[PDB]
Amino acid sequence: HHHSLGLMIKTAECRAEHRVLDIGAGAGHTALAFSPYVQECIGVDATKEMVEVASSFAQEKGVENVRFQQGTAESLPFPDDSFDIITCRYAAHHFSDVRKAVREVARVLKQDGRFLLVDHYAPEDPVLDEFVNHLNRLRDPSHVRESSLSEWQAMFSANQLAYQDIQKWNLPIQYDSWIKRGGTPADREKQIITHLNHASDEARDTFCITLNQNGQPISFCLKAILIQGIKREG
């Protein structure tokens, strides 16, 4: 996911004295990419296993200014106004309570600090919203919900973040590879195939659904965005 990462780095306007928090840090790629440009990166991930993976990956690359810990966005342990930049890349759809996550992000962000949020999102039309959320939940039972852009705008406003859409793009998904990386079993996959094959015309257009004549899916697109939040006042 080099495009989203490069976009975030570009948009962040990194300075050498900046402190960065990465929410849902995974194997540590986002934090490592920021590390040459800032003073310090802190990653939080929900699983102990990813915290250990990220830390050994930092060691293996010799970076000394990145640290990882276990935690969730819904309860960040950090003081108010402590980060210059907060990043969240393809993680929000896994939050158990996104409204509480944003409240926490806003709390720990410094005044005029930047929240850089990349995720795929639900179209405004509730039927397309539902189609894509169901598709992603079938493949990943960790999936909670991908919010609409309306919803993000309302959550930012609720927490005194200025909202800006930096870039929107279609995120192309190669079906065979997507199923393999999800480890989805045959019966779960059969449900995915039925879902894609029975898509409305509007869903087929919106999500760029490509199929074989025998109904075996080939590709589709998710709707991706980089949103920037800036902490202001109320």
Side-chain angles (χ1 to χ4, degrees):
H1 290 287
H2 287 185
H3 171 256
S4 50
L5 188 46
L7 242 205
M8 288 179 134
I9 291 164
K10 188 194 169 189
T11 305
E13 308 266 7
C14 298
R15 287 162 97 83
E17 70 276 7
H18 281 160
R19 299 196 186 167
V20 180
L21 169 65
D22 183 36
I23 300 176
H29 290 93
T30 306
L32 296 184
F34 271 83
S35 71
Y37 309 105
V38 298
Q39 187 178 86
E40 176 184 352
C41 299
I42 294 178
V44 300
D45 198 280
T47 74
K48 160 175 193 73
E49 35 270 47
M50 287 309 104
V51 171
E52 294 301 334
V53 170
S55 317
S56 68
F57 185 43
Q59 198 172 243
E60 163 184 307
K61 296 298 167 201
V63 308
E64 309 278 11
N65 70 331
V66 306
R67 284 192 61 113
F68 303 92
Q69 65 182 69
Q70 184 177 24
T72 60
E74 287 90 359
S75 192
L76 298 171
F78 306 108
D80 300 359
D81 307 286
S82 68
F83 296 96
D84 296 284
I85 302 164
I86 302 171
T87 61
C88 184
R89 189 168 63 128
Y90 298 118
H93 60 267
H94 289 136
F95 293 170
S96 62
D97 188 349
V98 61
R99 287 291 315 211
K100 181 45 158 191
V102 176
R103 191 184 326 159
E104 280 290 280
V105 163
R107 177 180 73 74
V108 304
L109 194 50
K110 289 177 179 166
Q111 277 303 141
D112 308 313
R114 283 170 210 275
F115 178 38
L116 300 169
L117 169 68
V118 168
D119 212 350
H120 37 90
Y121 63 87
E124 291 301 306
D125 178 1
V127 181
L128 300 177
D129 178 325
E130 180 175 333
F131 178 88
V132 70
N133 272 287
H134 188 61
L135 175 64
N136 283 320
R137 208 159 302 118
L138 281 173
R139 186 249 182 176
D140 179 5
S142 209
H143 186 88
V144 174
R145 169 175 172 77
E146 69 211 85
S147 299
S148 71
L149 300 182
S150 270
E151 291 173 328
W152 283 115
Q153 292 169 52
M155 298 193 269
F156 278 34
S157 201
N159 290 285
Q160 287 62 239
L161 312 181
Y163 173 103
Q164 192 177 346
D165 159 18
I166 303 295
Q167 192 187 46
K168 289 177 172 171
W169 67 95
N170 280 348
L171 172 65
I173 285 96
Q174 301 306 133
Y175 175 79
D176 278 341
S177 166
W178 187 68
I179 291 299
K180 278 190 80 184
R181 295 191 299 259
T184 82
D187 181 66
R188 261 301 206 268
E189 193 189 352
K190 289 288 204 177
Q191 296 175 54
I192 288 163
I193 294 166
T194 299
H195 191 57
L196 291 166
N197 273 92
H198 292 63
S200 65
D201 290 339
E202 314 80 55
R204 282 159 128 84
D205 181 40
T206 297
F207 302 109
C208 306
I209 296 175
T210 298
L211 310 171
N212 285 286
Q213 296 214 335
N214 72 172
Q216 181 70 9
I218 291 164
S219 62
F220 60 90
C221 289
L222 266 14
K223 317 309 283 199
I225 195 172
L226 168 61
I227 292 154
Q228 184 167 241
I230 295 167
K231 182 169 179 178
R232 303 296 192 201
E233 312 199 331

mmCIF file of all heavy atoms in Angstrom, residues 50-83:
data_model
loop_
_atom_site.group_PDB
_atom_site.id
_atom_site.type_symbol
_atom_site.label_atom_id
_atom_site.label_comp_id
_atom_site.label_asym_id
_atom_site.label_seq_id
_atom_site.Cartn_x
_atom_site.Cartn_y
_atom_site.Cartn_z
ATOM 1 N N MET A 50 1.448 -8.625 17.003
ATOM 2 C CA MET A 50 1.867 -7.564 16.080
ATOM 3 C C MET A 50 2.851 -6.599 16.728
ATOM 4 O O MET A 50 3.746 -6.075 16.073
ATOM 5 C CB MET A 50 0.659 -6.796 15.545
ATOM 6 C CG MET A 50 -0.196 -7.572 14.521
ATOM 7 S SD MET A 50 0.872 -8.380 13.008
ATOM 8 C CE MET A 50 0.855 -10.197 13.584
ATOM 9 N N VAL A 51 2.686 -6.344 18.008
ATOM 10 C CA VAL A 51 3.646 -5.504 18.727
ATOM 11 C C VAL A 51 5.066 -6.130 18.669
ATOM 12 O O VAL A 51 6.044 -5.437 18.449
ATOM 13 C CB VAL A 51 3.213 -5.289 20.201
ATOM 14 C CG1 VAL A 51 4.302 -4.623 20.995
ATOM 15 C CG2 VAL A 51 1.934 -4.474 20.263
ATOM 16 N N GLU A 52 5.150 -7.441 18.864
ATOM 17 C CA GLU A 52 6.437 -8.146 18.814
ATOM 18 C C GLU A 52 7.001 -8.151 17.384
ATOM 19 O O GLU A 52 8.182 -7.890 17.179
ATOM 20 C CB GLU A 52 6.284 -9.568 19.367
ATOM 21 C CG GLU A 52 5.949 -9.652 20.885
ATOM 22 C CD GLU A 52 7.008 -8.987 21.806
ATOM 23 O OE1 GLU A 52 8.192 -8.892 21.415
ATOM 24 O OE2 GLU A 52 6.652 -8.543 22.925
ATOM 25 N N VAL A 53 6.138 -8.395 16.396
ATOM 26 C CA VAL A 53 6.541 -8.368 14.977
ATOM 27 C C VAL A 53 7.077 -6.988 14.594
ATOM 28 O O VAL A 53 8.156 -6.880 14.018
ATOM 29 C CB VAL A 53 5.364 -8.781 14.043
ATOM 30 C CG1 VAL A 53 5.684 -8.515 12.571
ATOM 31 C CG2 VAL A 53 5.033 -10.251 14.223
ATOM 32 N N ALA A 54 6.348 -5.929 14.931
ATOM 33 C CA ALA A 54 6.796 -4.583 14.573
ATOM 34 C C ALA A 54 8.126 -4.221 15.227
ATOM 35 O O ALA A 54 8.995 -3.636 14.578
ATOM 36 C CB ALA A 54 5.721 -3.528 14.888
ATOM 37 N N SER A 55 8.289 -4.561 16.504
ATOM 38 C CA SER A 55 9.516 -4.220 17.232
ATOM 39 C C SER A 55 10.733 -4.943 16.650
ATOM 40 O O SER A 55 11.808 -4.362 16.557
ATOM 41 C CB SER A 55 9.419 -4.554 18.722
ATOM 42 O OG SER A 55 8.180 -4.187 19.275
ATOM 43 N N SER A 56 10.571 -6.202 16.261
ATOM 44 C CA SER A 56 11.702 -6.935 15.697
ATOM 45 C C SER A 56 12.018 -6.428 14.291
ATOM 46 O O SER A 56 13.179 -6.375 13.908
ATOM 47 C CB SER A 56 11.462 -8.442 15.721
ATOM 48 O OG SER A 56 10.439 -8.792 14.822
ATOM 49 N N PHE A 57 10.993 -5.999 13.555
ATOM 50 C CA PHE A 57 11.173 -5.401 12.229
ATOM 51 C C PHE A 57 11.948 -4.063 12.285
ATOM 52 O O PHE A 57 12.807 -3.809 11.426
ATOM 53 C CB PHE A 57 9.801 -5.269 11.539
ATOM 54 C CG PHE A 57 9.855 -4.767 10.120
ATOM 55 C CD1 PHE A 57 10.803 -5.243 9.216
ATOM 56 C CD2 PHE A 57 8.912 -3.848 9.667
ATOM 57 C CE1 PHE A 57 10.835 -4.779 7.914
ATOM 58 C CE2 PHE A 57 8.930 -3.393 8.354
ATOM 59 C CZ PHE A 57 9.897 -3.851 7.482
ATOM 60 N N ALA A 58 11.670 -3.235 13.303
ATOM 61 C CA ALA A 58 12.438 -2.006 13.569
ATOM 62 C C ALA A 58 13.914 -2.302 13.882
ATOM 63 O O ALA A 58 14.821 -1.649 13.351
ATOM 64 C CB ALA A 58 11.830 -1.245 14.711
ATOM 65 N N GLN A 59 14.130 -3.285 14.756
ATOM 66 C CA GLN A 59 15.474 -3.780 15.097
ATOM 67 C C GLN A 59 16.233 -4.262 13.854
ATOM 68 O O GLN A 59 17.354 -3.870 13.609
ATOM 69 C CB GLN A 59 15.349 -4.929 16.092
ATOM 70 C CG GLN A 59 16.615 -5.239 16.841
ATOM 71 C CD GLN A 59 16.358 -6.245 17.925
ATOM 72 O OE1 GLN A 59 16.531 -5.960 19.122
ATOM 73 N NE2 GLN A 59 15.894 -7.432 17.523
ATOM 74 N N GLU A 60 15.583 -5.103 13.066
ATOM 75 C CA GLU A 60 16.124 -5.601 11.794
ATOM 76 C C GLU A 60 16.492 -4.490 10.798
ATOM 77 O O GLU A 60 17.442 -4.646 10.019
ATOM 78 C CB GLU A 60 15.112 -6.575 11.176
ATOM 79 C CG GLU A 60 15.297 -6.883 9.706
ATOM 80 C CD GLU A 60 14.179 -7.774 9.163
ATOM 81 O OE1 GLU A 60 13.936 -8.848 9.772
ATOM 82 O OE2 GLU A 60 13.544 -7.391 8.143
ATOM 83 N N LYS A 61 15.757 -3.376 10.819
ATOM 84 C CA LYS A 61 16.092 -2.218 9.977
ATOM 85 C C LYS A 61 16.978 -1.197 10.706
ATOM 86 O O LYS A 61 17.395 -0.201 10.106
ATOM 87 C CB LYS A 61 14.816 -1.554 9.415
ATOM 88 C CG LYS A 61 13.995 -2.460 8.470
ATOM 89 C CD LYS A 61 14.809 -2.868 7.187
ATOM 90 C CE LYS A 61 14.167 -4.016 6.390
ATOM 91 N NZ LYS A 61 15.150 -4.756 5.470
ATOM 92 N N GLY A 62 17.263 -1.441 11.986
ATOM 93 C CA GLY A 62 18.150 -0.571 12.769
ATOM 94 C C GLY A 62 17.601 0.796 13.176
ATOM 95 O O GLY A 62 18.371 1.715 13.525
ATOM 96 N N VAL A 63 16.278 0.954 13.150
ATOM 97 C CA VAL A 63 15.678 2.242 13.527
ATOM 98 C C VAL A 63 15.505 2.322 15.053
ATOM 99 O O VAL A 63 14.973 1.411 15.678
ATOM 100 C CB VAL A 63 14.341 2.531 12.786
ATOM 101 C CG1 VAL A 63 14.499 2.378 11.286
ATOM 102 C CG2 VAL A 63 13.280 1.633 13.249
ATOM 103 N N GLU A 64 15.952 3.431 15.628
ATOM 104 C CA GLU A 64 15.997 3.622 17.070
ATOM 105 C C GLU A 64 14.931 4.591 17.611
ATOM 106 O O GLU A 64 14.809 4.759 18.827
ATOM 107 C CB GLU A 64 17.383 4.152 17.460
ATOM 108 C CG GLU A 64 18.570 3.322 16.889
ATOM 109 C CD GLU A 64 18.916 2.071 17.707
ATOM 110 O OE1 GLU A 64 18.119 1.690 18.611
ATOM 111 O OE2 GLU A 64 20.004 1.470 17.437
ATOM 112 N N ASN A 65 14.167 5.225 16.724
ATOM 113 C CA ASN A 65 13.217 6.256 17.129
ATOM 114 C C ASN A 65 11.733 5.852 16.923
ATOM 115 O O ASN A 65 10.860 6.718 16.838
ATOM 116 C CB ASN A 65 13.551 7.583 16.417
ATOM 117 C CG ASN A 65 13.249 7.551 14.920
ATOM 118 O OD1 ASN A 65 13.300 6.492 14.278
ATOM 119 N ND2 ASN A 65 12.926 8.715 14.360
ATOM 120 N N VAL A 66 11.468 4.547 16.854
ATOM 121 C CA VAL A 66 10.120 4.032 16.728
ATOM 122 C C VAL A 66 9.897 3.042 17.867
ATOM 123 O O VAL A 66 10.782 2.250 18.165
ATOM 124 C CB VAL A 66 9.838 3.356 15.327
ATOM 125 C CG1 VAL A 66 10.165 4.285 14.193
ATOM 126 C CG2 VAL A 66 10.616 2.051 15.168
ATOM 127 N N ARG A 67 8.748 3.108 18.528
ATOM 128 C CA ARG A 67 8.408 2.146 19.581
ATOM 129 C C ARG A 67 6.973 1.659 19.360
ATOM 130 O O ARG A 67 6.150 2.382 18.797
ATOM 131 C CB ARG A 67 8.595 2.767 20.983
ATOM 132 C CG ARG A 67 10.086 2.865 21.436
ATOM 133 C CD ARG A 67 10.255 3.221 22.950
ATOM 134 N NE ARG A 67 9.639 2.195 23.835
ATOM 135 C CZ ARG A 67 10.282 1.362 24.665
ATOM 136 N NH1 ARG A 67 11.599 1.414 24.828
ATOM 137 N NH2 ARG A 67 9.573 0.471 25.360
ATOM 138 N N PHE A 68 6.697 0.428 19.764
ATOM 139 C CA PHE A 68 5.375 -0.174 19.604
ATOM 140 C C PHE A 68 4.849 -0.616 20.953
ATOM 141 O O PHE A 68 5.596 -0.997 21.843
ATOM 142 C CB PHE A 68 5.405 -1.324 18.600
ATOM 143 C CG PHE A 68 5.917 -0.907 17.250
ATOM 144 C CD1 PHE A 68 7.271 -1.027 16.941
ATOM 145 C CD2 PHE A 68 5.068 -0.315 16.323
ATOM 146 C CE1 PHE A 68 7.766 -0.600 15.740
ATOM 147 C CE2 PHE A 68 5.554 0.124 15.093
ATOM 148 C CZ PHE A 68 6.900 -0.009 14.801
ATOM 149 N N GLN A 69 3.551 -0.477 21.138
ATOM 150 C CA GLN A 69 2.930 -1.001 22.333
ATOM 151 C C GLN A 69 1.555 -1.512 22.011
ATOM 152 O O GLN A 69 1.007 -1.198 20.953
ATOM 153 C CB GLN A 69 2.919 0.038 23.450
ATOM 154 C CG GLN A 69 2.078 1.278 23.222
ATOM 155 C CD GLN A 69 2.200 2.247 24.402
ATOM 156 O OE1 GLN A 69 3.252 2.841 24.632
ATOM 157 N NE2 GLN A 69 1.131 2.391 25.155
ATOM 158 N N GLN A 70 1.028 -2.341 22.905
ATOM 159 C CA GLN A 70 -0.309 -2.847 22.750
ATOM 160 C C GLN A 70 -1.318 -1.814 23.263
ATOM 161 O O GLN A 70 -1.139 -1.215 24.323
ATOM 162 C CB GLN A 70 -0.499 -4.181 23.480
ATOM 163 C CG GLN A 70 -1.886 -4.796 23.268
ATOM 164 C CD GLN A 70 -2.048 -6.163 23.934
ATOM 165 O OE1 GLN A 70 -1.341 -6.486 24.890
ATOM 166 N NE2 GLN A 70 -2.980 -6.971 23.423
ATOM 167 N N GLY A 71 -2.386 -1.624 22.502
ATOM 168 C CA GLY A 71 -3.483 -0.765 22.940
ATOM 169 C C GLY A 71 -4.511 -0.598 21.853
ATOM 170 O O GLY A 71 -4.303 -1.050 20.725
ATOM 171 N N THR A 72 -5.616 0.053 22.202
ATOM 172 C CA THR A 72 -6.711 0.317 21.276
ATOM 173 C C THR A 72 -6.957 1.814 21.179
ATOM 174 O O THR A 72 -6.702 2.555 22.121
ATOM 175 C CB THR A 72 -8.003 -0.393 21.713
ATOM 176 O OG1 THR A 72 -8.389 0.068 23.012
ATOM 177 C CG2 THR A 72 -7.791 -1.899 21.763
ATOM 178 N N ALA A 73 -7.457 2.247 20.023
ATOM 179 C CA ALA A 73 -7.799 3.649 19.777
ATOM 180 C C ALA A 73 -8.876 4.159 20.725
ATOM 181 O O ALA A 73 -8.928 5.352 21.032
ATOM 182 C CB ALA A 73 -8.271 3.810 18.329
ATOM 183 N N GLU A 74 -9.752 3.267 21.178
ATOM 184 C CA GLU A 74 -10.853 3.671 22.060
ATOM 185 C C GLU A 74 -10.372 4.058 23.455
ATOM 186 O O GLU A 74 -11.100 4.671 24.200
ATOM 187 C CB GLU A 74 -11.911 2.563 22.171
ATOM 188 C CG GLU A 74 -12.762 2.412 20.918
ATOM 189 C CD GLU A 74 -12.202 1.440 19.893
ATOM 190 O OE1 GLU A 74 -11.113 0.854 20.117
ATOM 191 O OE2 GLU A 74 -12.877 1.242 18.860
ATOM 192 N N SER A 75 -9.153 3.684 23.805
ATOM 193 C CA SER A 75 -8.568 4.057 25.093
ATOM 194 C C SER A 75 -7.075 4.227 24.943
ATOM 195 O O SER A 75 -6.309 3.320 25.201
ATOM 196 C CB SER A 75 -8.867 2.987 26.153
ATOM 197 O OG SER A 75 -8.550 3.477 27.455
ATOM 198 N N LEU A 76 -6.668 5.388 24.473
ATOM 199 C CA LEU A 76 -5.257 5.718 24.358
ATOM 200 C C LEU A 76 -4.730 6.175 25.725
ATOM 201 O O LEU A 76 -5.354 6.997 26.395
ATOM 202 C CB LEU A 76 -5.048 6.825 23.334
ATOM 203 C CG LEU A 76 -5.470 6.482 21.917
ATOM 204 C CD1 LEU A 76 -5.407 7.727 21.054
ATOM 205 C CD2 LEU A 76 -4.603 5.358 21.356
ATOM 206 N N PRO A 77 -3.576 5.643 26.138
ATOM 207 C CA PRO A 77 -3.035 5.977 27.446
ATOM 208 C C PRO A 77 -2.301 7.327 27.551
ATOM 209 O O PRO A 77 -1.877 7.699 28.634
ATOM 210 C CB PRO A 77 -2.067 4.813 27.692
ATOM 211 C CG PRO A 77 -1.527 4.499 26.290
ATOM 212 C CD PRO A 77 -2.745 4.638 25.431
ATOM 213 N N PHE A 78 -2.192 8.067 26.452
ATOM 214 C CA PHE A 78 -1.276 9.182 26.350
ATOM 215 C C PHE A 78 -1.916 10.419 26.893
ATOM 216 O O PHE A 78 -3.130 10.490 26.956
ATOM 217 C CB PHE A 78 -0.844 9.391 24.889
ATOM 218 C CG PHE A 78 -0.282 8.146 24.269
ATOM 219 C CD1 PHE A 78 -0.988 7.452 23.317
ATOM 220 C CD2 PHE A 78 0.940 7.646 24.697
ATOM 221 C CE1 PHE A 78 -0.474 6.279 22.772
ATOM 222 C CE2 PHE A 78 1.466 6.485 24.158
ATOM 223 C CZ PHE A 78 0.749 5.789 23.193
ATOM 224 N N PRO A 79 -1.100 11.407 27.298
ATOM 225 C CA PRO A 79 -1.645 12.672 27.790
ATOM 226 C C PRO A 79 -2.386 13.467 26.701
ATOM 227 O O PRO A 79 -2.134 13.274 25.514
ATOM 228 C CB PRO A 79 -0.389 13.449 28.205
ATOM 229 C CG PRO A 79 0.690 12.471 28.264
ATOM 230 C CD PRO A 79 0.371 11.412 27.303
ATOM 231 N N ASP A 80 -3.250 14.386 27.117
ATOM 232 C CA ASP A 80 -3.881 15.336 26.198
ATOM 233 C C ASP A 80 -2.802 16.072 25.411
ATOM 234 O O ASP A 80 -1.702 16.308 25.927
ATOM 235 C CB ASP A 80 -4.708 16.380 26.951
ATOM 236 C CG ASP A 80 -5.830 15.784 27.786
ATOM 237 O OD1 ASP A 80 -6.027 14.558 27.816
ATOM 238 O OD2 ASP A 80 -6.526 16.564 28.465
ATOM 239 N N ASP A 81 -3.116 16.467 24.180
ATOM 240 C CA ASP A 81 -2.238 17.349 23.398
ATOM 241 C C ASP A 81 -0.772 16.893 23.353
ATOM 242 O O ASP A 81 0.141 17.670 23.651
ATOM 243 C CB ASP A 81 -2.317 18.786 23.945
ATOM 244 C CG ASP A 81 -3.757 19.302 24.039
ATOM 245 O OD1 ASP A 81 -4.357 19.610 22.995
ATOM 246 O OD2 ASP A 81 -4.302 19.369 25.164
ATOM 247 N N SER A 82 -0.531 15.641 22.985
ATOM 248 C CA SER A 82 0.842 15.132 23.023
ATOM 249 C C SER A 82 1.465 14.771 21.663
ATOM 250 O O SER A 82 2.672 14.577 21.573
ATOM 251 C CB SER A 82 0.961 13.977 24.045
ATOM 252 O OG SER A 82 0.261 12.819 23.648
ATOM 253 N N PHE A 83 0.670 14.701 20.601
ATOM 254 C CA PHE A 83 1.209 14.355 19.284
ATOM 255 C C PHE A 83 0.966 15.450 18.238
ATOM 256 O O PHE A 83 -0.069 16.110 18.225
ATOM 257 C CB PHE A 83 0.633 13.021 18.792
ATOM 258 C CG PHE A 83 1.015 11.845 19.645
ATOM 259 C CD1 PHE A 83 0.161 11.387 20.632
ATOM 260 C CD2 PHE A 83 2.236 11.207 19.462
ATOM 261 C CE1 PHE A 83 0.518 10.309 21.425
ATOM 262 C CE2 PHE A 83 2.585 10.128 20.232
ATOM 263 C CZ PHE A 83 1.738 9.682 21.215
#
